[PDB]
Every structure is written in structure tokens, then in C-alpha cells.
């Protein structure tokens, strides 16, 4: 536990070696001095965010998504989806389909018939498993997609890798 204090007034930096102050923050004291100048930090803001919203910095491609596997794992719709875009699958619950890449940001490619096409990873559940289970599991919405996004501001130029539906597809018909 580092101690926790609270500012009773604002302070301005007069150095770049300085943080601001506002009466009422709140900070935990990392070095006191008898100088009078503590070493000091706010407190961190954490939270769950869309993946989809986020990009590296050193290149506009996840280094952590697991590769593609067109042979495909069994896997049923646990919650009822409709797509919205015309690269996502709509799903009654109960509909087998086969899961063929499960990407990070929470929107897996999947093979239903001989055509692929996103769908949400926590609306899925492996075939044969404990539906409830998979329903609990869930505990706030799918994550929005990055495609609903009107104009995005990236810090890299190039774009980042993402084969079509149509690719998927091509790859998906072929290898089995």
C-alpha cells in the first residue's frame, strides 16, 4: 500500500519536472522528502475497452492474434445475433457453425454453409458444452467493431493486414 493523500488546493507546474494539482485529486505518495517536494502519482484509471478502438505503436498489426485454422472447430450460437454489416453472420441460438479464426478483437471469422463471416465471440460456445455456462459468462455486450467506427485517426499510414471475406472464403472452401 502506498499512502494515499489528497490535494486541498491547485497546483500549477512552474517545471516540466512537475505535476498539476487540482483541489480535490487524489494521490498516492510515492517518496516523501523533507524538502518539502514529494514525488507523487494519481491514481490509475483502469477499465475493460473495446480492442477494436486500439492500435500498437510501433505498427498498425496485433502481434497476438492466434493464425487462421480452416479446418474449423464446432461451435454453436449461444445468443441470438443480426447482422448489421455485410461481413457479419446472423445467427438463431442454436445454429452450429465452425469457428475458423479467432481473432482479439472479439469478432471470430466463421464458416456457416461454404461462406464465412464475422460473428461475436462471446455469443459462441463449443458444441456439446454446458449452454448456461456460456450464457454467465457473458457480462456486458459484444465489443463494437472497428468497421462501425465513421472516421478513424490512426498514427501509422499503412493499414493494418485483415484478409476479406472473400479471401477467408477462398482459403475456407480449400482447405478442410
Wanted: hydrophobic share 35%; glycine share 6%.
Amino acid at each position: 500500500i502506498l499512502q494515499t493523500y489528497r490535494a486541498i488546493a491547485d497546483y500549477e507546474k512552474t517545471s516540466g519536472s512537475e505535476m498539476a494539482l487540482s483541489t480535490g485529486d487524489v494521490v498516492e505518495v510515492v517518496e516523501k522528502s523533507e524538502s518539502g517536494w514529494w514525488f507523487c502519482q494519481m491514481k490509475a484509471k483502469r477499465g475493460w475497452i473495446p480492442a477494436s478502438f486500439l492500435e500498437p505503436l510501433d505498427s498498425p498489426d496485433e502481434t497476438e492474434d492466434p493464425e487462421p485454422n480452416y479446418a474449423g472447430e464446432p461451435y454453436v450460437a449461444i445468443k441470438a445475433y443480426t447482422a448489421v454489416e455485410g461481413d457479419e453472420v446472423s445467427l438463431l441460438e442454436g445454429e452450429a457453425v465452425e469457428v475458423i479464426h479467432k481473432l482479439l478483437d472479439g469478432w471470430w471469422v466463421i464458416r456457416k454453409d461454404d461462406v464465412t463471416g464475422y460473428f461475436p465471440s462471446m455469443y459462441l460456445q463449443k458444441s456439446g458444452q454446458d449452454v448456461s455456462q456460456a450464457q454467465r459468462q457473458i457480462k456486458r455486450g459484444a465489443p463494437p467493431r472497428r468497421s462501425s467506427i465513421r472516421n478513424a485517426h490512426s498514427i501509422h499510414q499503412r493499414s493494418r493486414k485483415r484478409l476479406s471475406q472473400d479471401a477467408y472464403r477462398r482459403n475456407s472452401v480449400r482447405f478442410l
